[PDB]
Paper text:
Transcription factor (TF) IIIC, a six-subunit protein complex with a molecular weight (MW) of 624 kDa in humans, facilitates transcription of type 1 (5S ribosomal RNA) and type 2 [e.g., transfer RNAs (tRNAs)] RNA polymerase (Pol) III target genes. τA binds the A-box with low affinity and is required to recruit TFIIIB to the promoter DNA. τB interacts with the B-box with high affinity and, therefore, is essential for target DNA recognition of type 2 genes. hTFIIIC consists of τA subunits TFIIIC35, TFIIIC63, and TFIIIC102 and τB subunits TFIIIC90, TFIIIC110, and TFIIIC220.
The cryo-EM structure of DNA-bound human τB enabled us to unveil the molecular basis of B-box DNA recognition. The 3.2-Å cryo-EM map of DNA-bound τB was of sufficient quality to assign 35 bp (55 to 89) of the DNA sequence. We could also assign the N-terminal third (1 to 716) of subunit TFIIIC220 (τ138 in yeast) featuring four WH domains and one extended WH (eWH) domain to human τB. The first step involves the high-affinity DNA sequence and shape readout of the B-box motif via an assembly cascade of WH domains. WH2 and WH4 of TFIIIC220 are an integral part of the rigid τB-core, formed by TFIIIC90-TFIIIC110 and the TFIIIC220-WH1 domain, and their conformation does not change upon DNA binding, suggesting that they provide the platform for initial DNA recognition. In addition, the TFIIIC-DNA interaction is further stabilized by the WD40 domain in TFIIIC110, which binds the DNA downstream of the B-box via a positively charged groove. Subsequently, the WH3 and eWH domains recognize the upstream half of the B-box, and the WH domains, collectively, enclose the B-box motif and its upstream region. K657 (eWH) binding induces the opening of the DNA major groove and compaction of the corresponding minor groove, whereas R422/Q423 and R401 (WH3) widen the DNA minor groove. Hence, TFIIIC initiates recognition of the tRNA gene promoter in an evolutionary conserved manner via a combined DNA shape and sequence readout of the B-box DNA motif.
Author numbering:
A (entry chain C): 290 to 762, 785 to 890
B (entry chain B): 50 to 258, 271 to 590, 663 to 822
C (entry chain A): 1 to 314, 328 to 337, 356 to 459, 579 to 585, 610 to 716
DNA sequence: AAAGGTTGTGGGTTCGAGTCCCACCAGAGTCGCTT
DNA sequence: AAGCGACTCTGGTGGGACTCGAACCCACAACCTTT
């Protein structure tokens, strides 16, 4: 227990776990990531076909302009203007606080950061999916298989010199005929290489490997080129939204050779890559409750077949019936990848040993849960709940030990609404969570090697990032015609006097007492939250929701001299290794 | 042909572990479940008219105490566990805290005391003529169970306890020169000492020859412990040896025994399959028995390392029609496929062919069973598909042809967690669960065991008439199909009667008289247990006549052995003169062979009485009648149906069907009747226990 | 079953309180099927050795000597009219041999009743060595301890004796439900009547016994029959018979065996018609018996009432002719379950939906749908109205968008206001004075009106009849019970909105219960209740 | 004239509903010892 | 003094079991009810 106050205004015993998580995450990635993997799966220009304006029209999300909104920033003068931005466009970053907002044309339902090796100093990208229609909603029990667009957004390099005046750029998108995408996961490492890498004209330098959980019941794997390499091949006069039709590296689906009998598994709902080198396994969760594993390199004629177009179809090597209901979320253990956790709509969290799948390590029955986060250093998992079964006033976010330490669940944050999505920053040891209330909070967990019951007041360890309010001005147009989004951002520059600043009072008056609204579209609701996995930009967060606005925030107060120290040393090491 | 049999069997607890249903040669069905092993005992009940399967239910309780694998002293292990749990490295600390092998119980971890796997021994392994049950918990307690009385299973031995001590005594070294005294404080050695004795799966050998049976236990590190049990198995006393062989297979998933005969030369090995896909037969290089011998060198059946886990293995003896020789067919479940390999000794040695029969299922195979008499495979997946898979001989090796059996048509939308097949292929037993209802999940989950007829009555009747094994208890599942028909239609089908009379006329061996007695007793139950009264009296007269014939043949055989061994002048344990009188009583006794036998005996018999006394009176029992003896004071003593001595002891043995009674052997009995008293019942061929 | 096993079975068919030695011999002598071996002192010593040498049997000294058993035989099994009557013929209900005292929550899981379970002491090791050699003869044991020697079979043997060989040992039962089984078990072939179990064995509400009996029916350990008790009144009472499956026999009834003969008679007569007198005379039956059979055949729907002239059977002659919603919700990925549940209730609108109908529509467990309803009420987005239908005061849930306009709201609000009026209009031979939902408030208001307009009303039947017709005019299918009225009248008595006055008047050798209901403004001394008593006594007069 | 379908009665059956009350939870308080 | 880590002390809710209130059903006597 370390005394005194950090210069950011949090007590040192509250910040000390955050500073420890930097070293633990670095020591892990040095051992169990790698600089290059899947060397065959590299992008080819002839596999990327640019759609004309006429061909792209079915795929673009159908709202051409955002709802009207205004952003108020804590302690700055009131803006008072209402912004509205075109689809695939961004406001400019605020010059002091560097928040960026851009609009994707539909409700955002998948989102991931493109992972980049430490010290690379690359341009930072997010890949996301936004549904075609703001008001249509899809059943779980049925395959959809409509059109949809996978969108790749570049955020810049997010250096301090780059953030003033930054804007998000829609660099390209892939027109998918495979329905809506329920999850996105990039290959955790070894997928990225320098955009300057010399490669022959058919080939393109690789930006990443991206797996899509489709509502068509299959997983799609793409290898992504760097944008400049496509635009060098693209005609110079091409349409400015670069929409491509792209061949998969592989389609991943449940089945067997010559087994014409269509699988009962239904929609694919969630993904996890194997966290550790060589990342050779990918898992998916299915509506029937099975968890399904594919051995991505597999040569075996019983698992791999090559289609006439040259793409692979991969059948799984292992499947087991994890849940008695749709398995909504997976997390695969980083510290030892023999272990995995899953949660399903039977509202059990089940820990698994993948060597011994016949019985879970531990099943804890809980409330219905939407997403899980497994922070590297902590043995347990933090859970986001759907509120429909929680006791009123006890719904929220819980950390749950996997069982050996035997602690009770730690109530890291009360929330009134359902927390739709959750992300744990390994670098920060902090967690961020989006609510149908339209509020984004962050919370610092204690060192969960130590019994949480000593945490006398967890409210000192959490803060809001922003809240969206509808201000008057059950369907989208009837809502947009009569409301605008007031985004109330906090001053993340420091946490001094936190519990007396208005956003904490506003949040604390939200918690416990506030009543959910059901006579509206939930236009303020936030659907995905993602901390950056990259050491560069490690302090950055992205979020988006029903509005189809996507917003980026830098949590300046959790960035620290150790992260700067580690960024500089990693830059030096990276610059020595690659030149 | 496939239709449901009427009783669904409700299970109180969640089905648990690997491949959880099995059907023993003893017609006991075990399901491994989270709180017990439930055992379903199929009785061909001759005392009741109910058409259902008469399933007697028993269970093995789950253990009350969580098993800890011994890896060191009680103090040194405690400081090591503290060291690893407190480790600041995420990998070491979380590897310790997640792996349940190191943590069989904890403050907030559910106890893993339910059952991981079960295997049934051959018959004759128990202290009675019955089979033993090997049971493995998920906390790695391996135990051998027997049902000595009918009511309660007792643990005969814990093999994990013994093996842990023997490893400790050898400091966890198999070869004392080969390894250091590696420090338990090293996580690799700590993990190894757990891994080297965590049992994966287990199988019994056949009966070696005094009888003996082996048990091979597979450990996570690829060691195999081959236990040798003396028979009848009564506990630790009967464990003749334990020997560990190092397979070297990484992550071994499954094990089965290979046993084979060519030119009357016996051969055997262990076939072992990796979770990473390959399949290899080990030569069992170490054994003490002299009659068996072992394969000379390992053979690789599948080499590919494709990571399709070998979930199950089965093999069946066959005779190949075109290669005109006996061969062994191996079938193995690999993901959703069935691997099959045919092993054929010839002048070239082993000739080997293999393939994957493909397109069976769109999900991994959750269980597999082999019809030992035909090699018919059944395979199953949690989508509720079951596929019958018929081996068809080919000029070289085989082809497999297969067909789905629509459980949808008999049970509706269903999930299947396991299958088993009766020893003659008469029934398929299925662990059914509520299926997806038009794409909705079922709200509540309730496991059951359900049965379907694999064979028509006419095929069961024919196979019983042409039975090579000629013991009814080996065929309870076929005579149950015959029983169901007779109880349903209240008459014996004429073709079966006519064919049985022809067999009795042309062959007349006591098997066919036992088969006749079964049909007539089930007929009597069928007709509501005064033309019906006249018919009841008629067929009960027929039952009594054939019951009397079987008695005559057994009495003749008993006296036909009293004559062979040294004359028991003291009449010590057989009512010899009473039996001789009973075999001369009637002019029905036209059999000259019995008459001359009792002639020679009565010439040799002592003139001294040596009578049998009622213990409550010390007064004689006259030997008037087959079933029971009475004294003047009116006591009634049953007679041992194997030796006709009166069962005056406070404990004596009873047939599985309670149709017959037998005495316990005593040290005063000579060896030859101590062997005679091990005969099955003369009427039902069931164990008299 | 073997003699030696039939002994141990009988020892296990008593409960955890077991047998005395004289009880054991009595049980064996009364066994069915008959005990194979005739009891005599040497035989009884042999059977005693069979107990002492058995490791599952155990022996205790209880602090006081137990009563000896009665002749248990429950049933008459004779008649003077055609056939026989096997109705219950009551023995004297002497002090029970086995008064029940459940061994609740036992840490070893042993279950049953024993009044001395904590007080009796084991004497196993006195009766036998630990090597199971018997230390005492039966005569020594009965000399030393007498009736205090109690023999009990192990729980494994006792539970086996209740479920038989086909029964599953893994099934745990609640202690109260297990004690029902062993109360049945010790009755052997003549099961306890459910009436008697709750009345005098368990001494509980019939609802309690039914509720605890449910699990035994659900798992199928017992068999249900209707059975008939012949009272000393000569009248006979219906009650349920419970038989443990081992002991099930399909019990017949006099009216059943006689209606079978009539069914055979009429079905074999080619016309399927005969006159009642010949239907009687061919069976020798009296009209008092036969008219039950006639109406049973009619109520069974097997025959039809017919009349034909004698020239038509060949004057009118009586004859008998024989003759024999809510659609399921597809859960969407993109909304929380509280939102989706409100979307359901909005679609129902003015009519609402029940918690059970939500559960089926949402495909959720009972506890899960309960929490949905609780939260939506607490959020004030949905409002719950009680509705009585069938036997059940369900709740129907309506969104606050529609709730005020709903028929349930409007009807309830009317009857609440009407109740407030009808209460506020209240004024500022040996008689004794006795101690929400739309339909319930309607019934309350209608009674309050009646006592306001008719300051005396002469019987509870008058209240029921007007209520029944009022509800029938409304079209209610359910028929109001007497108990519901008298409990309702009791509620109004505690609210002080009426007096109910009860007595029995006596006249010309007969007696009548009066049950006068009157407005609170009068006491039992009022000439009006006296006039009512007199005018009842008049019409009761011969 | 000359009698039976039609009904009310005391009590048990039973059906699904809402209620119980204990264990557990989240928060705030106590205070022996340290800093 | 100011602070910490057990150790309590205080209001609130749900899980399964179970009280609850109702209609439904027997078989009888009452007689209203009918040619
Ligand atoms: Zn005698
Ligand atoms: Zn027998």
């Amino acid at each position: 227990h370390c005394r005194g106050m950090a210069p950011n205004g949090l007590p040192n015993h509250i910040m000390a776990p955050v500073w420890k998580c930097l070293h633990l995450t670095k020591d892990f990635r040095e051992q169990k990531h790698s600089y290059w993997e899947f060397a065959e799966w590299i992008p080819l220009a002839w596999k990327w076909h640019l759609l004309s304006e006429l061909e792209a029209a079915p795929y673009l999300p159908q709202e051409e302009k955002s709802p009207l909104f205004s952003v108020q920033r804590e302690g700055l003068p009131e803006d008072g203007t209402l912004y509205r931005i075109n689809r695939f466009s961004s406001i400019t970053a605020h010059p002091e606080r560097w928040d960026v907002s851009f609009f994707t044309g539909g409700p955002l339902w998948a989102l991931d950061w493109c992972p980049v090796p430490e010290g690379a100093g690359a341009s930072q990208y997010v890949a996301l999916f936004s549904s075609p229609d703001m008001n249509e909603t899809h059943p779980l029990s049925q395959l959809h298989s409509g059109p949809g667009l996978l969108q790749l957004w570049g955020l810049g390099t997010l250096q301090q010199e780059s953030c003033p005046g930054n804007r998000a750029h829609f660099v390209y998108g892939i027109a998918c005929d495979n329905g809506c995408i329920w999850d996105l996961k990039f290959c955790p490492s070894g997928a990225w290489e320098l955009p300057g890498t010399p490669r022959k004209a058919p080939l393109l330098p690789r930006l990443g490997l991206l797996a899509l959980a489709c509502s068509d019941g299959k997983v799609l794997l793409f290898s992504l080129p760097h944008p400049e390499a496509l635009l060098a091949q693209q005609p110079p006069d091409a349409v400015k939204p670069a929409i491509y039709k792209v061949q998969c590296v592989a389609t991943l689906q449940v089945g067997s050779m010559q087994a014409t009998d269509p699988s009962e598994c239904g929609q694919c709902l969630s993904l996890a890559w194997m966290p550790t080198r060589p990342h050779q396994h990918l898992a998916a969760g299915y509506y029937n409750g099975m968890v399904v594993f594919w051995n991505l390199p597999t040569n075996s004629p019983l698992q791999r077949i090559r289609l006439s177009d040259g793409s692979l179809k991969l059948y799984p090597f292992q499947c087991f019936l994890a849940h008695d209901q749709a398995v909504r979320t997976l997390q695969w253990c980083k510290a030892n990848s023999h272990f995995l956790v899953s949660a399903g709509s039977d509202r059990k969290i089940k820990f698994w040993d993948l060597r011994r799948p016949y019985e879970p390590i531990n099943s804890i029955k809980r409330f219905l849960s939407t997403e899980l986060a497994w922070l590297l250093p902590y043995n347990g998992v933090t859970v986001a709940q759907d509120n429909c079964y929680a006791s009123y006033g006890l719904c929220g976010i819980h950390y749950i030990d996997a069982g050996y330490l035997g602690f009770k669940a730690y109530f890291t944050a009360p929330r009134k609404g359902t927390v739709w999505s959750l992300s744990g920053s390994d670098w920060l040891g902090t967690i961020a969570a989006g609510d149908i209330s339209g509020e984004l909070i962050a919370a610092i967990l204690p060192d969960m090697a130590l019994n949480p019951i000593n945490v006398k007041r967890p409210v000192e360890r959490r803060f809001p990032i922003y809240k969206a309010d509808l201000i008057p001005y059950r369907t989208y147009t009837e809502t947009v015609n009569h409301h605008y989004l007031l985004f109330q951002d906090t001053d993340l520059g420091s946490f001094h006097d936190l519990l007396r600043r208005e956003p904490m009072l506003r949040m604390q008056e939200g918690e416990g007492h506030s009543q959910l609204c059901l006579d509206r579209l939930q236009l303020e609701a936030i659907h995905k939250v993602r901390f950056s996995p990259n050491l560069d930009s490690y302090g950055w967060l992205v979020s988006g929701g029903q509005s189809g606005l996507v917003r980026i925030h830098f949590v300046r107060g959790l960035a620290s001299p150790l992260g700067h120290r580690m960024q500089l040393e990693s830059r030096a090491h990276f610059n020595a290794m690659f030149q | 042909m496939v239709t449901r049999r009427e009783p669904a069997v409700k299970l109180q607890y969640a089905v648990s572990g690997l491949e959880p249903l099995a059907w023993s040669e003893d017609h006991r069905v075990s399901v491994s479940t989270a709180r017990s092993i439930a055992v379903l005992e199929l009785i061909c009940d001759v005392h009741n008219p109910g058409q259902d399967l008469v399933i007697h239910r028993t269970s093995v309780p789950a253990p009350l105490n969580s098993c800890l694998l011994k890896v060191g002293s009680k103090t040194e292990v405690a400081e090591c566990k503290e060291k690893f749990a407190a480790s600041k490295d995420p990998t070491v600390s979380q590897t310790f805290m997640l792996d349940r092998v190191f943590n069989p119980e904890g403050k907030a971890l559910p106890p893993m005391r339910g059952f991981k796997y079960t295997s049934w021994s051959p018959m004759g392994c128990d202290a009675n003529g019955r089979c033993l049950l090997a049971a493995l918990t998920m906390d790695n307690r391996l135990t051998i169970q027997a049902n000595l009385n009918r009511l309660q299973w007792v643990q005969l031995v814990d093999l994990t306890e013994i093996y842990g001590e023997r490893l400790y005594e050898t400091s966890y070294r198999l070869s004392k020169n080969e390894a250091p005294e590696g420090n338990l404080g090293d996580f690799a050695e700590f993990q190894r000492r757990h891994s080297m004795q965590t049992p994966v799966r287990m199988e019994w050998s056949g009966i070696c020859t005094v009888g003996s049976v082996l048990l091979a236990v597979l450990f996570e590190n690829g060691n195999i412990a081959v236990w040798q049990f003396q028979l009848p198995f009564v506990g630790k006393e009967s464990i003749s040896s334990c020997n560990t062989i190092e397979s070297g297979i990484t992550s071994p998933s499954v094990l089965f025994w290979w046993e084979y005969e060519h030119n009357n030369r016996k051969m055997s090995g262990l076939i072992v399959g990796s979770a990473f896909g390959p399949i290899k037969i080990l030569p069992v290089n170490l054994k003490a028995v002299k009659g068996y011998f072992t394969l000379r060198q390992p053979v690789i059946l599948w080499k590919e390392m494709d990571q399709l886990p070998v979930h199950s293995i089965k093999c069946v003896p066959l005779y190949h029609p075109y290669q005109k020789c006996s061969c062994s067919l191996v079938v193995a479940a690999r993901g959703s496929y069935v691997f099959w390999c045919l092993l054929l000794i010839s002048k070239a040695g082993l000739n080997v062919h293999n393939s994957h029969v493909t397109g069976l299922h769109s999900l991994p195979i959750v269980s597999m069973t082999a019809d030992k008499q035909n090699g018919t495979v059944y395979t199953c997946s949690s989508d509720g598909k079951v596929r019958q898979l018929i081996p068809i001989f080919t000029d070289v090796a085989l082809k497999f042809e297969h067909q789905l059996i629509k459980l949808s048509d008999v049970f509706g939308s269903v999930r299947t967690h396991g299958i088993a097949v009766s020893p003659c292929g008469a029934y398929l037993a299925i662990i059914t669960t509520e299926g997806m209802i038009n794409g909705l999940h079922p709200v509540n989950k309730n496991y059951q065991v359900q049965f379907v007829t694999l064979k028509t009555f006419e095929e069961a009747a024919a196979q019983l008439l042409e039975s090579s094994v000629q013991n009814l208890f080996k065929q309870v599942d076929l005579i149950d199909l015959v029983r169901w028909k007779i109880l349903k239609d209240k008459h014996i089908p004429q073709f079966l009667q006519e064919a049985l009379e022809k067999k009795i006329e042309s062959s007349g061996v006591t098997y066919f008289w036992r088969f006749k007695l079964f049909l007539l007793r089930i007929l009597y139950q069928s007709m509501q247990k005064e033309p019906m009264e006249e018919k009841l009296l008629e067929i009960q007269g027929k039952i009594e006549a054939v019951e009397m014939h079987l008695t005559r043949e057994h009495m003749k055989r008993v006296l036909g052995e009293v004559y062979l061994h040294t004359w028991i002048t003291e009449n010590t344990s057989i009512p010899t003169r009473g039996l001789c009188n009973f075999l001369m009583s009637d002019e029905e006794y036209d059999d000259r062979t019995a008459r001359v036998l009792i002639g020679h005996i009565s010439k040799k018999m002592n003139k001294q009485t040596f009578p049998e006394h009622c213990s409550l009176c010390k007064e004689i029992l006259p030997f008037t009648d087959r079933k029971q003896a009475v004294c003047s004071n009116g006591h009634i003593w049953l007679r041992c149906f194997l030796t006709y001595q009166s069962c005056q002891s406070l404990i004596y043995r009873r047939c599985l069907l309670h149709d017959s009674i037998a005495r316990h052997p005593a040290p005063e009995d000579p060896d030859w009747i101590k062997r005679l008293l091990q005969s099955p019942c003369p009427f039902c061929d069931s164990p008299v226990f | 079953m073997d003699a030696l096993e039939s002994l141990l079975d009988e020892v296990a068919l008593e409960g955890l309180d077991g047998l005395c030695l004289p009880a054991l011999w009595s049980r064996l002598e009364t066994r069915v099927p008959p005990f194979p071996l005739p009891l005599e002192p040497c035989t009884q010593e042999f059977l005693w050795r069979a107990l002492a040498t058995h490791p599952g049997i155990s022996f205790y000294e209880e602090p006081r000597e137990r009563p000896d058993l009665q002749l248990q035989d429950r049933y008459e099994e004779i008649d003077l009219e055609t056939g026989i009557l096997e109705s219950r013929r009551d023995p004297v209900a002497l002090e029970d041999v086995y008064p029940i005292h459940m061994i609740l929550e036992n840490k070893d899981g042993i279950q049953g009743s024993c009044r001395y379970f904590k007080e009796r002491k084991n004497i196993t090791n006195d009766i036998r060595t630990k090597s199971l050699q018997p230390r005492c003869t039966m005569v020594e044991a009965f000399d030393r301890w007498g009736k205090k020697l109690i023999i009990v079979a192990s729980q494994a043997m006792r539970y086996r004796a209740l479920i038989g060989q086909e029964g599953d040992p893994d099934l745990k039962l609640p202690d109260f439900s297990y004690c029902i089984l062993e109360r049945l078990g010790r009755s052997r072939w003549q099961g306890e009547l459910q009436r008697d179990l709750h009345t005098t064995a368990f001494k509980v509400d019939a609802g309690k016994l039914h509720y605890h009996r449910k699990i035994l029916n659900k798992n199928g350990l017992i068999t249900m029959q209707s059975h008939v008790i012949r009272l000393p009144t000569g009248a006979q009472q219906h009650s349920i018979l419970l038989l443990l499956n081992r002991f099930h026999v399909d019990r017949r009834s006099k009216y059943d065996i006689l209606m079978e003969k009539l069914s055979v008679m009429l079905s074999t007569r080619t016309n399927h018609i005969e006159t009642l007198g010949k239907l009687r005379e061919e069976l020798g039956l009296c009209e008092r018996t036969f008219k039950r059979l006639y109406q049973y055949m009619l109520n069974a729907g097997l025959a039809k009432v017919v009349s034909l002239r004698l020239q038509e059977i060949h004057v009118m002659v009586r004859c008998l002719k024989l003759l024999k919603t809510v659609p399921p919700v597809d859960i969407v990925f993109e909304r929380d379950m509280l939102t989706q549940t409100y979307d359901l209730i909005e679609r129902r609108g003015t009519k609402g939906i029940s918690q059970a109908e939500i559960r089926v529509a949402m495909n959720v467990g009972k506890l899960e749908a309960r929490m949905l309803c609780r939260l939506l009420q607490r959020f004030k987005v949905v409002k719950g109205f009680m509705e009585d239908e069938g036997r059940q005061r369900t709740t129907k849930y309506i969104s606050c968008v529609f709730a005020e306009e709903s028929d349930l709201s409007r009807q309830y609000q009317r009857e609440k206001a009407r109740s407030e009026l009808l209460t506020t209009v209240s004024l500022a031979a040996v008689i004794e004075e006795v101690r929400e939902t739309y339909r319930l408030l309607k019934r309350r208001n209608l009674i309050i009106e009646a006592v306001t307009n008719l300051r005396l009303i002469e019987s509870l039947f008058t209240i029921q009849k007007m209520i029944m017709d009022q509800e029938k005019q409304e079209g209610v299918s359910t028929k109001c019970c007497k108990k519901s009225i008298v409990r309702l009248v009791r509620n109004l008595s505690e609210e002080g909105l009426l007096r109910l006055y009860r007595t029995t008047v006596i006249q010309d050798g007969i007696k009548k219960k009066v049950d006068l209901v009157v407005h609170p403004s009068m006491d039992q001394n009022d000439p009006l209740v006296r006039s009512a008593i007199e005018q009842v006594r008049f019409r009761i007069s011969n």
